Scaffold this active site. Structure first.
Site, PDB file in Angstrom:
ATOM      1  N   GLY A  41     -81.327  61.556  35.583  1.00 42.12           N
ATOM      2  CA  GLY A  41     -81.855  62.748  34.537  1.00 42.12           C
ATOM      3  C   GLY A  41     -81.234  62.383  33.097  1.00 42.12           C
ATOM      4  O   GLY A  41     -81.170  61.109  33.165  1.00 42.12           O
ATOM      5  N   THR A  42     -81.444  63.310  32.296  1.00 39.47           N
ATOM      6  CA  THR A  42     -81.052  63.016  30.892  1.00 39.47           C
ATOM      7  C   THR A  42     -80.044  63.941  30.377  1.00 39.47           C
ATOM      8  O   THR A  42     -79.883  65.087  30.441  1.00 39.47           O
ATOM      9  CB  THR A  42     -82.332  62.966  30.155  1.00 39.47           C
ATOM     10  OG1 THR A  42     -82.293  63.499  28.609  1.00 39.47           O
ATOM     11  CG2 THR A  42     -83.603  63.186  30.631  1.00 39.47           C
ATOM     12  N   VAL A  43     -79.073  63.306  29.447  1.00 47.13           N
ATOM     13  CA  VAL A  43     -78.170  64.155  28.729  1.00 47.13           C
ATOM     14  C   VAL A  43     -78.232  64.258  27.129  1.00 47.13           C
ATOM     15  O   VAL A  43     -78.345  63.346  26.646  1.00 47.13           O
ATOM     16  CB  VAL A  43     -76.637  63.583  29.036  1.00 47.13           C
ATOM     17  CG1 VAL A  43     -75.444  64.512  28.292  1.00 47.13           C
ATOM     18  CG2 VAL A  43     -76.196  63.275  30.442  1.00 47.13           C
ATOM     19  N   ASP A  90     -67.174  60.024  44.239  1.00 44.05           N
ATOM     20  CA  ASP A  90     -67.808  59.062  43.361  1.00 44.05           C
ATOM     21  C   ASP A  90     -66.811  58.841  42.227  1.00 44.05           C
ATOM     22  O   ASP A  90     -67.353  58.695  41.071  1.00 44.05           O
ATOM     23  CB  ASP A  90     -69.140  59.601  42.930  1.00 44.05           C
ATOM     24  CG  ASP A  90     -69.893  58.592  42.438  1.00 44.05           C
ATOM     25  OD1 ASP A  90     -69.773  57.435  42.236  1.00 44.05           O
ATOM     26  OD2 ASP A  90     -71.054  59.275  41.619  1.00 44.05           O
ATOM     27  N   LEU A  91     -65.577  58.699  42.329  1.00 44.43           N
ATOM     28  CA  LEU A  91     -64.710  58.540  41.053  1.00 44.43           C
ATOM     29  C   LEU A  91     -64.949  57.031  40.582  1.00 44.43           C
ATOM     30  O   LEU A  91     -64.767  56.217  41.601  1.00 44.43           O
ATOM     31  CB  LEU A  91     -63.288  58.468  41.559  1.00 44.43           C
ATOM     32  CG  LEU A  91     -62.087  58.468  40.472  1.00 44.43           C
ATOM     33  CD1 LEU A  91     -62.266  59.083  39.003  1.00 44.43           C
ATOM     34  CD2 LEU A  91     -60.725  58.688  41.095  1.00 44.43           C
ATOM     35  N   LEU A 105     -78.269  61.301  24.694  1.00 43.82           N
ATOM     36  CA  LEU A 105     -77.495  60.458  24.657  1.00 43.82           C
ATOM     37  C   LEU A 105     -77.198  59.227  25.849  1.00 43.82           C
ATOM     38  O   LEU A 105     -76.815  58.201  25.729  1.00 43.82           O
ATOM     39  CB  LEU A 105     -76.039  61.156  25.178  1.00 43.82           C
ATOM     40  CG  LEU A 105     -74.875  61.622  24.051  1.00 43.82           C
ATOM     41  CD1 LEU A 105     -75.375  61.108  22.704  1.00 43.82           C
ATOM     42  CD2 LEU A 105     -74.569  63.069  24.110  1.00 43.82           C
ATOM     43  N   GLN A 150     -68.803  71.121  27.018  1.00 49.34           N
ATOM     44  CA  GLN A 150     -68.518  70.900  25.580  1.00 49.34           C
ATOM     45  C   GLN A 150     -68.503  69.371  25.482  1.00 49.34           C
ATOM     46  O   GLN A 150     -68.421  68.537  26.302  1.00 49.34           O
ATOM     47  CB  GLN A 150     -66.579  71.032  25.550  1.00 49.34           C
ATOM     48  CG  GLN A 150     -65.990  70.443  24.263  1.00 49.34           C
ATOM     49  CD  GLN A 150     -64.884  71.399  23.872  1.00 49.34           C
ATOM     50  OE1 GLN A 150     -64.935  72.811  23.812  1.00 49.34           O
ATOM     51  NE2 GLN A 150     -63.585  71.071  23.738  1.00 49.34           N
ATOM     52  N   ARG A 207     -67.147  54.805  35.062  1.00 49.76           N
ATOM     53  CA  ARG A 207     -68.556  55.556  34.483  1.00 49.76           C
ATOM     54  C   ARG A 207     -68.645  56.928  34.444  1.00 49.76           C
ATOM     55  O   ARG A 207     -69.383  57.548  33.813  1.00 49.76           O
ATOM     56  CB  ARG A 207     -69.617  54.994  35.079  1.00 49.76           C
ATOM     57  CG  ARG A 207     -70.019  55.341  36.405  1.00 49.76           C
ATOM     58  CD  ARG A 207     -71.174  54.875  37.202  1.00 49.76           C
ATOM     59  NE  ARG A 207     -71.762  55.741  38.296  1.00 49.76           N
ATOM     60  CZ  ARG A 207     -71.191  56.128  39.332  1.00 49.76           C
ATOM     61  NH1 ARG A 207     -70.220  55.739  39.742  1.00 49.76           N
ATOM     62  NH2 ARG A 207     -71.956  56.988  40.021  1.00 49.76           N
ATOM     63  N   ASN A 208     -67.692  57.590  35.364  1.00 49.59           N
ATOM     64  CA  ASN A 208     -67.410  59.276  35.484  1.00 49.59           C
ATOM     65  C   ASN A 208     -66.323  59.790  34.754  1.00 49.59           C
ATOM     66  O   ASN A 208     -65.575  60.702  35.219  1.00 49.59           O
ATOM     67  CB  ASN A 208     -67.743  59.470  37.049  1.00 49.59           C
ATOM     68  CG  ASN A 208     -68.958  59.343  37.581  1.00 49.59           C
ATOM     69  OD1 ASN A 208     -70.007  59.295  36.790  1.00 49.59           O
ATOM     70  ND2 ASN A 208     -69.110  58.708  38.731  1.00 49.59           N
ATOM     71  N   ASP A 265     -68.879  64.530  36.745  1.00 45.71           N
ATOM     72  CA  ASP A 265     -69.978  63.911  37.459  1.00 45.71           C
ATOM     73  C   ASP A 265     -69.638  64.308  39.237  1.00 45.71           C
ATOM     74  O   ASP A 265     -69.322  63.677  39.843  1.00 45.71           O
ATOM     75  CB  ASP A 265     -70.046  62.342  37.776  1.00 45.71           C
ATOM     76  CG  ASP A 265     -71.516  62.225  36.995  1.00 45.71           C
ATOM     77  OD1 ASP A 265     -72.396  61.493  37.672  1.00 45.71           O
ATOM     78  OD2 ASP A 265     -71.777  62.484  35.885  1.00 45.71           O
TER      79      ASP A 265
END
Ligand SMILES: [Mn+2]
Length: 285
Positions: A28-30, A139-140, A22, A93, A143-144, A157
């Protein structure tokens, strides 16, 4: 504080199938995935996050996993969800529609005041629960925030999230971007629920501008001085003064006088009942 007997579920790798990446990069990677729980038959659509192959990164990933495992809120991402082989992977989820920031960009011609105001409600609602658990996100940003479906978003996040203890009313220290952090965090590294409120201001501003980039084209270096002088983000073209005022209340110097998440939730709820009163968007009622 009450003891935390959340149960951490350790997933065997054979329970997880990785289907599609995704997203990827420095963080890193999702992956998108199926999870079949031991030993059931049901197939659960799942997101699987791993670090890219590079000191305290693994430990902190686990800290992040503990936070997500300890909460059950409709607007906070919950862990399922930890697998260890061949590397650490956090399993949550699946949020089909990705992150909210991209969502509002793609669908800008299609998003009305009802959804935009509702997102303000849900995000504030999530943050509310974080306060009750004494957790500062740090970190709101849009994008999160992830999108389960058009009218259901979740904050994620929690990697830089810190749990306030005892008498502590602030946290003192990561690399959250300066354009979303409160002036007092920039200067004194003074992270509180009230600094998060500032970030919320910037977040909802990203929404009202359909994925606007805040202070766009101004170098990070120049930001502290911009904000010292009293400059703030402009009034988005769709925003009535009622809505912008809320944004501006979040960016006041006195952190404590800033509206609270509880108050922001109630206020955007009041607006949510007559949306076109409060946001003025072409082609909408
Ligand atoms: Mn820069």
């Amino acid at each position: 504080t009450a003891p935390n007997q959340a149960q951490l579920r350790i997933l065997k790798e054979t329970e997880l199938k990785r289907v599609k990446v995704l997203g990827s990069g420095a963080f890193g990677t999702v992956y998108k995935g199926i999870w079949v729980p031991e030993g059931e038959t049901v197939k659960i659509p799942v997101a699987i996050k791993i670090l890219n192959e590079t000191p305290k990164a693994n430990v902190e990933f686990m800290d992040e996993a503990l936070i997500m495992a300890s909460m059950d809120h409709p607007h906070l991402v919950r862990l399922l969800g930890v697998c260890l082989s061949p590397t650490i992977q956090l399993v949550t989820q699946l949020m089909p529609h990705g992150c909210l920031l991209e969502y509002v960009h793609e669908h800008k011609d299609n998003i009305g005041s009802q959804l935009l105001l509702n997102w303000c409600v849900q995000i504030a609602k999530g943050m509310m629960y974080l306060e009750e658990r004494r957790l500062v996100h740090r970190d709101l940003a849009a994008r999160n925030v992830l999108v389960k479906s058009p009218n259901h978003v979740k904050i994620t996040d929690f990697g830089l999230a810190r749990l306030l203890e005892g008498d502590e009313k602030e946290y003192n220290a990561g690399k959250m971007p300066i354009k979303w952090m409160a002036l007092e965090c920039i200067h004194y590294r003074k992270f509180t629920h009230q600094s998060d409120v500032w970030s919320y201001g910037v977040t909802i501003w990203e929404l009202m501008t359909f994925g606007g980039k805040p202070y766009d084209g101004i170098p990070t270096r120049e930001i502290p001085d911009l904000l010292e002088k009293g400059e703030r983000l402009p009034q988005p073209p769709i925003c009535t003064i009622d809505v912008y005022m809320v944004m501006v209340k979040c960016w006041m110097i006195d952190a404590d006088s800033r509206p609270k998440f509880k108050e922001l939730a109630a206020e955007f709820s009041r607006m949510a009942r007559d949306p076109q009163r409060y946001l003025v968007i072409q082609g909408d009622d």
